[PDB]
């Protein structure tokens with residue numbers, strides 16, 4: 001008996017085996033093993049976890065224990081000496097729009113979420129961790145180096161809490177610690193609809209038989225919907241501006257308001273569901289609410305799948321695309337569709353793609369107002385700039401017309417994220433996402449850089465010189481050695497991202513392998529994959545492959561000019577055409593006759 005037993009975070013129910021619709025939780029996708037890919041289950045392990053005590057303590061916890069003979073460097077040190085930089089000039093990606101970064105975050109949020117541990121509201125725990133920086137239980141602080149300016153200004157550490165895990169929440173004790181994925185592993189738009197029946201239902205408009213999602217009642221965007229506000233106070237969104245007092249939005253995913261451009265994409269998707277559902281009510285007047293909801297939902301999930309696999313993946317993986325994701329051959333019930341623990345770190349290549357500012361453009365795509373270009377850090381958990389400063393059209397135009405940041409070995413992550421991150425649970429704009437990613441690697445018990453190179457069949461450098469040749473960078477390799485003392489101890493997030501980009505792509509070999517395997521598996525092991533015979537009809541398929549992010553914008557905003565290939569860098573006005581030139585989604589194939 002393999003470690004097959006434990007199952008408890010978990011909400012349990014029965015499977016209607018002939019339902020043409022996915023469950024909200026992901027259960028029932030695989031017929032022989034119904035829990036596969038479901039939400040609130042453990043992240044899969046492609047390799048055994050590596051903890052300090054073999055079971056649960058992260059490396060770096062016990063200051064005297066080493067990793068292969070050496071102390072592991074402080075997360076914030078590595079951040080300071082390797083990841084930071086000062087000059088934002090020359091840093092933009094010349095052939096990827098801001099939308100390229102933004103889509104990655106959306107896909108990521110549909111596939112994985114490992115929430116921090118809670119246990120204790122009205123507990124000195126949240127206090128003992130932030131106020132005193134005392135390591136202990138789920139408090140695993142990021143200590144500041146000596147010479148770090150945050151020491152003079154912020155305190156002795158940045159609080160950090162370990163990720164939730166399967167089985168409990170209490171002192172669990174024997175088999176290795178496994179973190180939770182709170183969302184469904186299938187690319188199914190769970191970030192729009194929710195992963196729990198509890199939330200899925202609350203998101204819906206059930207007082208009307210139209211199969212629509214609830215929309216904001218306090219505010220409108222020139223007649224277009226906004227996501228509803230969240231009930232819960234205190235909300236970090238009203239905190240960043242107690243005068244405006246505008247709460248975070250309520251969406252299928254809890255991270256929706258982390259930054260204004262993410263909330264903007266969530267709004268576009270909410271609108272498409274309603275557009276689709278009312279458009280479907282027109283062709284099938286007899287269909288009921290539930291049918292409208294499920295059928296629009298199914299359509300929206302196919303859209304996310306199509307854009308991801310047809311438009312997005314090919315420009316991340318480049319020439320490695322064909323190597324890891326061969327053409328679709330059909331559903332394979334033997335494939336594990338679960339998202340792996342390491343994927344959630346590999347997919348973090350996106351953090352190095354975020355630029356320092358966000359712009360709002362007017363109708364001619366020229367600056368909108370006098371304070372049109374804003375620093376990223378003022379937009380974390382900011383919903384007021386949307387409700388009170390022009391709606392989403394100005395931000396959407398920036399998404400289309402501005403560029404992503406390009407990964408650069410000398411310029412990894414912007415200070416907006418590296419020194420000024422705002423955490424929903426705390427009150428300063430002073431966190432470091434890079435140090436957090438590093439610390440989280442250790443928290444999730446990740447094998448080191450060389451373990452993953454071997455897994456992907458790549459050479460494994462043992463020397464500084466071996467490491468120079470792989471990174472193709474003498475000094476980066478050297479700072480890496482000085483901090484880590486052996487390439488075996490290099491945290492995967494930084495190791496993976498330090499490698500040069502493959503041809504036509506935006507990640508290196510190690511990441512291409514880790515990303516590509518994962519995507520191949522969630523496609524091949526998804527019974528509801530859009531191309532799987534029987535999910536949609538042939539005619540429905542011919543209609544779905546004409547979707548494009550450009551059309552989505554046209555139908556759901558007041559923007560009338562869009563580029564044809566939204567993910568590449570596009571210059572206004574030459575690369576911008578009229579919305580009426582853009583292929584629409586033909587829903588006639590969804591018309592039924594029941595006589």
Ligand code: HEM
Pocket residue numbers: 101102103104105108109112113114115258259343344345347348349350351353354433436437440
């Ligand atoms: C602010 C943040 C972003 C933009 C300004 C941002 C952006 C991205 C991109 C573009 C990603 C992929 C293409 C991506 C992936 C994942 N992130 Fe990240 N992200 C912002 C902020 C955060 C924060 C805060 C976290 C949590 C860090 C922690 O470990 O505590 C974060 C994480 C992740 C993540 C893991 C999700 C999970 O499985 O739990 C990605 C796959 N991002 N982000």
Ligand SMILES: *[C@@H]1O[C@H](CO)[C@@H](O[C@@H]2O[C@H](CO)[C@@H](O[C@H]3O[C@H](CO)[C@@H](O)[C@H](O)[C@@H]3O)[C@H](O)[C@H]2NC(C)=O)[C@H](O)[C@H]1NC(C)=O
Pocket residue numbers: 095315565568569
């Ligand atoms: C900026 O990036 C653009 C998109 O990545 C790129 O254009 C793309 O170039 C590739 C070259 O491989 C072509 O790829 C397509 O080739 C044919 C289409 O003629 C198809 O049969 C293939 O399946 C594949 O999709 C495309 O012509 C184009 N890709 C897309 C999706 O439009 C530009 O070259 C880049 N610009 C610069 C200046 O480098």
Ligand SMILES: *[C@@H]1O[C@H](CO)[C@@H](O[C@@H]2O[C@H](CO)[C@@H](O[C@H]3O[C@H](CO)[C@@H](O)[C@H](O)[C@@H]3O)[C@H](O)[C@H]2NC(C)=O)[C@H](O)[C@H]1NC(C)=O
Pocket residue numbers: 240241243244384388
């Ligand atoms: C917190 O949110 C506040 C309200 O949203 C915001 O104040 C608002 O923004 C500015 C003040 O700086 C004013 O906007 C402008 O309005 C017209 C443009 O249509 C101009 O002609 C005006 O001169 C003015 O500059 C709003 O009047 C103002 N609203 C209120 C109620 O004060 C704050 O700036 C936000 N504070 C922080 C710290 O973010």
Ligand SMILES: *[C@@H]1O[C@H](CO)[C@@H](O[C@@H]2O[C@H](CO)[C@@H](O)[C@H](O)[C@H]2NC(C)=O)[C@H](O)[C@H]1NC(C)=O
Pocket residue numbers: 205207208210212213214215216217
């Ligand atoms: C649920 O749907 C109903 C019906 O579509 C929404 O109410 C309508 O929409 C707007 C704003 O309320 C107005 O044109 C009418 O007052 C309503 N028409 C009808 C037929 O009721 C309602 O806003 C939705 N509720 C939520 C919470 O989203």
Ligand SMILES: *[C@@H]1O[C@H](CO)[C@@H](O[C@@H]2O[C@H](CO)[C@@H](O)[C@H](O)[C@H]2NC(C)=O)[C@H](O)[C@H]1NC(C)=O
Pocket residue numbers: 332333334335
């Ligand atoms: C369905 O997926 C399974 C699991 O990934 C595939 O298994 C392959 O089959 C060989 C033996 O025939 C196994 O050793 C490997 O796990 C897989 N091959 C390789 C090269 O790794 C299987 O091929 C798939 N089945 C179908 C019908 O496509």
Ligand SMILES: O=C(NO)c1ccccc1O
Pocket residue numbers: 105255258
């Ligand atoms: O935004 C996030 N990820 O992309 C995020 C992830 C974990 C915790 C909170 C957050 O805001």
Ligand SMILES: [Ca+2]
Pocket residue numbers: 110111183184185186187188189190191
């Ligand atoms: Ca999902």
